[PDB]
Design an enzyme around this catalytic site. Structure first.
Site, PDB file in Angstrom:
ATOM      1  N   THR B  10       0.874  -1.417  -0.045  1.00 41.65           N
ATOM      2  CA  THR B  10       0.003   0.089  -0.073  1.00 41.65           C
ATOM      3  C   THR B  10       0.868   1.377  -0.240  1.00 41.65           C
ATOM      4  OG1 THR B  10      -0.116  -0.227   2.200  1.00 41.65           O
ATOM      5  CG2 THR B  10      -2.069  -0.951   1.284  1.00 41.65           C
ATOM      6  N   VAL B  13       6.574   2.614  -2.558  1.00 42.19           N
ATOM      7  CA  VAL B  13       7.207   1.458  -3.093  1.00 42.19           C
ATOM      8  C   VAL B  13       6.265   0.225  -3.432  1.00 42.19           C
ATOM      9  CG1 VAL B  13       9.081  -0.471  -2.939  1.00 42.19           C
ATOM     10  CG2 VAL B  13       9.633   1.909  -2.072  1.00 42.19           C
ATOM     11  N   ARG B  38      -3.702  -1.903   9.804  1.00 44.60           N
ATOM     12  CA  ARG B  38      -4.438  -0.724   9.232  1.00 44.60           C
ATOM     13  C   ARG B  38      -5.018  -0.856   7.835  1.00 44.60           C
ATOM     14  NH1 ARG B  38       0.147   1.097  11.453  1.00 44.60           N
ATOM     15  NH2 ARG B  38       1.206   1.208   9.590  1.00 44.60           N
ATOM     16  N   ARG B  98      21.384  -6.221   4.499  1.00 41.06           N
ATOM     17  CA  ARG B  98      22.220  -6.031   3.564  1.00 41.06           C
ATOM     18  C   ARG B  98      23.649  -6.083   3.846  1.00 41.06           C
ATOM     19  NH1 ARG B  98      19.579  -0.073   2.245  1.00 41.06           N
ATOM     20  NH2 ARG B  98      18.007  -0.694   0.754  1.00 41.06           N
ATOM     21  N   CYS B 127      18.304   2.854  -3.166  1.00 42.40           N
ATOM     22  CA  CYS B 127      18.090   3.460  -4.277  1.00 42.40           C
ATOM     23  C   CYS B 127      19.451   4.220  -4.795  1.00 42.40           C
ATOM     24  CB  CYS B 127      17.057   4.446  -4.281  1.00 42.40           C
ATOM     25  SG  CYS B 127      16.789   5.669  -2.583  1.00 42.40           S
ATOM     26  N   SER B 157       9.933  11.138  -2.456  1.00 39.40           N
ATOM     27  CA  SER B 157       9.200   9.875  -2.732  1.00 39.40           C
ATOM     28  C   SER B 157       9.962   8.466  -1.893  1.00 39.40           C
ATOM     29  CB  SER B 157       8.766   9.311  -3.980  1.00 39.40           C
ATOM     30  OG  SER B 157       9.908   9.199  -4.872  1.00 39.40           O
ATOM     31  N   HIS B 251      16.134  10.247  -8.090  1.00 37.96           N
ATOM     32  CA  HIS B 251      17.187  10.959  -7.534  1.00 37.96           C
ATOM     33  C   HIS B 251      18.231  11.480  -8.394  1.00 37.96           C
ATOM     34  CE1 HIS B 251      15.600   9.509  -3.830  1.00 37.96           C
ATOM     35  NE2 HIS B 251      16.315   8.359  -3.599  1.00 37.96           N
ATOM     36  N   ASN B 324      14.106   6.708  -8.479  1.00 36.52           N
ATOM     37  CA  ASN B 324      14.265   6.031  -7.180  1.00 36.52           C
ATOM     38  C   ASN B 324      13.243   5.097  -6.739  1.00 36.52           C
ATOM     39  OD1 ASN B 324      12.642   8.597  -6.592  1.00 36.52           O
ATOM     40  ND2 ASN B 324      12.510   7.534  -4.506  1.00 36.52           N
TER      41      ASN B 324
HETATM   42  N1  LIG Z   1      15.589   0.428  -1.880  1.00 37.40           N
HETATM   43  C1  LIG Z   1      15.430   1.657  -1.519  1.00 37.40           C
HETATM   44  O1  LIG Z   1      16.215   2.836  -1.644  1.00 37.40           O
HETATM   45  C2  LIG Z   1      14.245   1.969  -0.752  1.00 37.40           C
HETATM   46  C3  LIG Z   1      13.530   3.170  -1.092  1.00 37.40           C
HETATM   47  C4  LIG Z   1      12.215   3.289  -0.405  1.00 37.40           C
HETATM   48  C5  LIG Z   1      11.801   2.614   0.531  1.00 37.40           C
HETATM   49  N2  LIG Z   1      12.387   1.411   0.924  1.00 37.40           N
HETATM   50  C6  LIG Z   1      12.000   0.416   1.927  1.00 37.40           C
HETATM   51  O2  LIG Z   1      10.587   0.495   1.976  1.00 37.40           O
HETATM   52  C7  LIG Z   1      10.165   0.836   3.198  1.00 37.40           C
HETATM   53  C8  LIG Z   1       8.625   1.598   2.804  1.00 37.40           C
HETATM   54  O3  LIG Z   1       8.867   2.467   1.635  1.00 37.40           O
HETATM   55  P1  LIG Z   1       7.648   3.380   1.370  1.00 37.40           P
HETATM   56  O4  LIG Z   1       8.417   4.590   0.413  1.00 37.40           O
HETATM   57  O5  LIG Z   1       6.663   2.357   0.366  1.00 37.40           O
HETATM   58  O6  LIG Z   1       6.996   3.948   2.797  1.00 37.40           O
HETATM   59  P2  LIG Z   1       5.397   4.292   2.842  1.00 37.40           P
HETATM   60  O7  LIG Z   1       5.076   4.824   1.473  1.00 37.40           O
HETATM   61  O8  LIG Z   1       5.371   5.129   4.177  1.00 37.40           O
HETATM   62  O9  LIG Z   1       4.958   2.705   3.008  1.00 37.40           O
HETATM   63  C9  LIG Z   1       4.997   1.994   4.003  1.00 37.40           C
HETATM   64  C10 LIG Z   1       4.578   0.469   3.840  1.00 37.40           C
HETATM   65  O10 LIG Z   1       4.948  -0.238   4.934  1.00 37.40           O
HETATM   66  C11 LIG Z   1       3.699  -0.985   5.479  1.00 37.40           C
HETATM   67  N3  LIG Z   1       3.829  -1.171   6.957  1.00 37.40           N
HETATM   68  C12 LIG Z   1       4.331  -0.185   7.770  1.00 37.40           C
HETATM   69  N4  LIG Z   1       4.188  -1.031   8.957  1.00 37.40           N
HETATM   70  C13 LIG Z   1       3.981  -2.085   8.849  1.00 37.40           C
HETATM   71  C14 LIG Z   1       3.759  -3.387   9.832  1.00 37.40           C
HETATM   72  N5  LIG Z   1       4.021  -3.159  11.285  1.00 37.40           N
HETATM   73  N6  LIG Z   1       3.670  -4.614   9.116  1.00 37.40           N
HETATM   74  C15 LIG Z   1       3.394  -4.490   7.755  1.00 37.40           C
HETATM   75  N7  LIG Z   1       3.468  -3.660   7.084  1.00 37.40           N
HETATM   76  C16 LIG Z   1       3.746  -2.326   7.447  1.00 37.40           C
HETATM   77  C17 LIG Z   1       2.685  -0.131   5.381  1.00 37.40           C
HETATM   78  O11 LIG Z   1       1.459  -0.463   5.334  1.00 37.40           O
HETATM   79  P3  LIG Z   1       0.064   0.363   5.975  1.00 37.40           P
HETATM   80  O12 LIG Z   1      -0.317   1.020   4.662  1.00 37.40           O
HETATM   81  O13 LIG Z   1      -0.839  -0.644   6.416  1.00 37.40           O
HETATM   82  O14 LIG Z   1       0.560   1.144   7.022  1.00 37.40           O
HETATM   83  C18 LIG Z   1       3.100   0.557   4.029  1.00 37.40           C
HETATM   84  O15 LIG Z   1       2.710  -0.522   2.678  1.00 37.40           O
HETATM   85  C19 LIG Z   1      11.001   1.743   3.461  1.00 37.40           C
HETATM   86  O16 LIG Z   1      10.844   2.204   4.948  1.00 37.40           O
HETATM   87  C20 LIG Z   1      12.338   1.135   3.377  1.00 37.40           C
HETATM   88  O17 LIG Z   1      12.606   0.005   4.308  1.00 37.40           O
HETATM   89  C21 LIG Z   1      13.745   0.839   0.174  1.00 37.40           C
HETATM   90  O1  LIG Z   2      12.565   2.855   8.894  1.00 33.19           O
HETATM   91  C1  LIG Z   2      12.770   1.912   8.261  1.00 33.19           C
HETATM   92  O2  LIG Z   2      12.292   0.826   8.582  1.00 33.19           O
HETATM   93  C2  LIG Z   2      13.616   1.758   7.093  1.00 33.19           C
HETATM   94  C3  LIG Z   2      13.772   3.219   6.407  1.00 33.19           C
HETATM   95  C4  LIG Z   2      14.102   3.342   5.213  1.00 33.19           C
HETATM   96  C5  LIG Z   2      13.825   4.714   4.517  1.00 33.19           C
HETATM   97  C6  LIG Z   2      14.131   4.827   3.140  1.00 33.19           C
HETATM   98  C7  LIG Z   2      15.296   4.135   2.420  1.00 33.19           C
HETATM   99  C8  LIG Z   2      15.567   3.076   3.234  1.00 33.19           C
HETATM  100  C9  LIG Z   2      16.687   2.183   2.648  1.00 33.19           C
HETATM  101  O3  LIG Z   2      17.905   2.016   2.986  1.00 33.19           O
HETATM  102  O4  LIG Z   2      16.529   1.750   1.354  1.00 33.19           O
HETATM  103  C10 LIG Z   2      15.107   2.701   4.544  1.00 33.19           C
HETATM  104  C11 LIG Z   2      15.829   1.557   5.257  1.00 33.19           C
HETATM  105  O5  LIG Z   2      15.432   0.402   4.882  1.00 33.19           O
HETATM  106  O6  LIG Z   2      16.580   1.588   6.221  1.00 33.19           O
END
Ligand SMILES: NC(=O)c1ccc[n+]([C@@H]2O[C@H](COP(=O)([O-])OP(=O)(O)OC[C@H]3O[C@@H](n4cnc5c(N)ncnc54)[C@H](OP(=O)(O)O)[C@@H]3O)[C@@H](O)[C@H]2O)c1
Ligand SMILES: O=C(O)CCc1cccc(C(=O)O)c1C(=O)O
Ligand SMILES: NC(=O)c1ccc[n+]([C@@H]2O[C@H](COP(=O)([O-])OP(=O)(O)OC[C@H]3O[C@@H](n4cnc5c(N)ncnc54)[C@H](OP(=O)(O)O)[C@@H]3O)[C@@H](O)[C@H]2O)c1
Ligand code: NA
Ligand code: NA
Ligand code: NA
Lengths: 357, 357
Positions: B10, B13, B38, B98, B127, B157, B251, B324
């Site tokens: 949701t 990403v 949620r 990682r 990213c 984002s 980015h 990104n």
């Molecule tokens: N490779 C990269 O550089 C990169 C880039 C961006 C993100 N990420 C990773 O992906 C994560 C989320 O990114 P986003 O930008 O998509 O964040 P976001 O838009 O805030 O989305 C958070 C997602 O995580 C879910 N979530 C939160 N708490 C949870 C729980 N306890 N159990 C299961 N699901 C849960 C949320 O579900 P609900 O809607 O139910 O809250 C939502 O689907 C980041 O924190 C990071 O670890 C990695």
């Molecule tokens: O708070 C978290 O769970 C992760 C936050 C986060 C936000 C944005 C990019 C990243 C990432 O390293 O890709 C991350 C991470 O996984 O550490």
């Protein structure tokens, strides 16, 4: 007091020149505002006094003691020599005269002494260069500078009033009309004088000014050449990447240096804090660092994120921010003028070194 | 065909994970969407099919072949080992695993071979790291890499749907209501999990993630550590400055490198053009260079402004842009899954190597 003229009074820098002059310690007996044919006849304030904008001509500079030029490279090239002919001392904001060996290129905190030998024209440097020099001069003084590598994050006000308005219109079309940023129409940015124009809204444009023959832009090469002249040391290696971002005012720079001797980071912080015009804003435990939005309206240059390179013994990284229309242009210029007053250097030049075009 | 689960379906990403899966060559027999309590019970499309979102728990993974995790480090830490225990192959998009030596950290164009020895978890890098790796690997192959200095220009984002909404709201307040940017109220940026929050509208924030004890941020240190592991070379010196700017997606990065051998600048361009996943966009005569707004929606990584350093013989500067959420996250992850399928690596793991929490 002095008769002071602002050439380009109606533009983005012009406005701040007026503000800086209003708040200056320069004794001003008469203020005159100059611009192009199309502004002539309009009225602009100086404090509560109404001033009538005049057209810039060859014969407009009689009686003028100090003229601050911020009307574009072409206007300074044409009319600054006639000002000097008329006995004026000219502080020029443009890049035209900066690399002329008869013209001091001055940041008052770093090389005020260069003012003493002026021949009627003092050049204010590039905004991005000025704030870097304020940040680095205190480090150079104590531990030397072997090289600089800088990547800039430049505000659109640096490209003029038209660039500010284009930026605001673009962003409204995206947020209000749902236009995709890649579909926006652009006329000015990245460079008003170049052939193609691109949207800045939600973008980062790695082009400031036009490209030079070596594939660096003129902005980047100004940072290189102006640094060497300001610090009077051609052996300092300087390479830049200059990028425009969707900020209205205040430039930010990611600066990497290698010193000649190892500089303890706590001493570097103290040295920058002690340098006039530089403010240390560096407390990562409380997420304190320089920010464009906080710097707007301040004459100071703000430095933080100061830290050792992870590998290079003599390498240091930092983040430098200043308002590009104040310390980057109008304040540097007014500060030059105040410095000229203080040092008894506001007087007509004997010899003319500059062609009349 | 496979049963595929998207954990964090949701968010920012997750929406792109869905799109990349919809467009993938993976043979998918069943899709499951997992998120938090949620979203549990709400519905979301896969192509034309309605899919009910499920809460992520220790028991949610029975029958699943492949799970793509993008729901935060905590969620991966808590649940990915249970998915592995259940027999799932996990592609984790978070930072959590990682730097574990039992976990391949993969960009398929660079180090697909590392997939062969997986133990049920494959980590997708950060990213910013990913796009830099795609630009630099073809350089390293021919001429080596000695060091990297990088300053980033990162879109909002990357910090999630909330960050995106916050940014849009702030800009609207400034542009439509006339609020000054330093007067804006922020709740998320620069980092949701840090104590203080600052406005991003018309600003540049030199903080991404929280600070580490060496005064670099976690984002900067991830770039350093991930580079070394992905390129399987601890001798590569890497220092970064990571800065959030007012861009919604894509980015950009100002990348400086020094190679091991001199790398002729036109051959560097050719080598990058020839590297799969990298597109050369570099024709300064026609003001062609990568731009964030043009990169949005493409899986490719765009590279230009490629030029020699003015002094360092082996030094090279360039500009690198990628979406990104695509190559920086969802597309890299799905590309890993495709690569696992293609190499017969989608199978349960015999030995459990990950702590159950
Ligand atoms: N490779 C990269 O550089 C990169 C880039 C961006 C993100 N990420 C990773 O992906 C994560 C989320 O990114 P986003 O930008 O998509 O964040 P976001 O838009 O805030 O989305 C958070 C997602 O995580 C879910 N979530 C939160 N708490 C949870 C729980 N306890 N159990 C299961 N699901 C849960 C949320 O579900 P609900 O809607 O139910 O809250 C939502 O689907 C980041 O924190 C990071 O670890 C990695
Ligand atoms: O708070 C978290 O769970 C992760 C936050 C986060 C936000 C944005 C990019 C990243 C990432 O390293 O890709 C991350 C991470 O996984 O550490
Ligand atoms: N659309 C136009 O081309 C236009 C029309 C009227 C005024 N201007 C001036 O230029 C700006 C237009 O956008 P911009 O982004 O270029 O502004 P800007 O760079 O922020 O300001 C440039 C300044 O230089 C002055 N100037 C330009 N050419 C000149 C000349 N040949 N002789 C004397 N003065 C000269 C302008 O006065 P002028 O304002 O008198 O040009 C203006 O004050 C205005 O702010 C205004 O100052 C431009
Ligand atoms: Na040197
Ligand atoms: Na390619
Ligand atoms: Na196969």
């Amino acid at each position: 007091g002095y008769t002071v003229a602002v050439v380009g009074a109606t533009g983005a820098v012009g406005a701040q020149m007026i503000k800086m002059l209003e708040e200056s310690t320069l004794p001003i007996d008469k203020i005159r505002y100059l611009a192009s044919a199309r502004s002539a006849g309009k009225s602009l304030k100086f404090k509560d006094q109404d001033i009538t904008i005049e057209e810039t001509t060859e014969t407009a500079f009689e009686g003028v003691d100090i003229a601050l030029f911020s009307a574009g490279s072409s206007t300074s090239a044409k009319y600054a020599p006639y000002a000097v002919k008329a006995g004026v001392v000219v502080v020029d904001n443009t890049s035209y005269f900066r690399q002329n060996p008869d013209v001091p290129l001055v940041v008052p905190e770093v090389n005020a002494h260069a003012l003493d030998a002026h021949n009627g024209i003092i050049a204010c440097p590039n905004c991005s260069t000025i704030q870097m020099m304020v940040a680095l001069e205190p480090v150079r003084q104590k531990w030397g500078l072997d090289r600089i590598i800088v990547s800039t994050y430049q505000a659109v006000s640096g490209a003029g009033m038209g660039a500010i308005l284009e930026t605001q219109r673009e962003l409204r079309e995206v947020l209000n009309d749902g236009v995709k940023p890649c579909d926006l129409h652009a006329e000015i940015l990245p460079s008003g004088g170049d052939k193609k124009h691109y949207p800045i809204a939600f973008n980062a444009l790695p082009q400031i000014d036009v490209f030079t023959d070596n594939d660096y832009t003129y902005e980047e090469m100004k940072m290189t050449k102006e640094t060497k002249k300001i610090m009077e040391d051609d052996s300092i290696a300087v390479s830049a990447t200059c990028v425009r971002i969707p900020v209205l005012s205040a430039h930010s720079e990611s600066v990497y240096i290698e010193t000649k001797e190892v500089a303890p980071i706590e001493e570097v912080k103290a040295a920058i804090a002690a340098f006039p015009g530089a403010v240390l804003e560096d407390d990562v435990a409380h997420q304190i660092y320089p920010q464009a939005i906080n710097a707007v309206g301040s004459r100071d240059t703000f430095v933080g994120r100061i830290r050792k390179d992870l590998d290079a013994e003599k390498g240091i990284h930092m983040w430098v921010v200043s308002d590009n229309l104040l310390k980057g242009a109008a304040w540097n210029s007014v500060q030059i003028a105040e410095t000229l007053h203080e040092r008894g250097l506001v007087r007509p030049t004997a010899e003319l070194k500059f062609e009349l075009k």
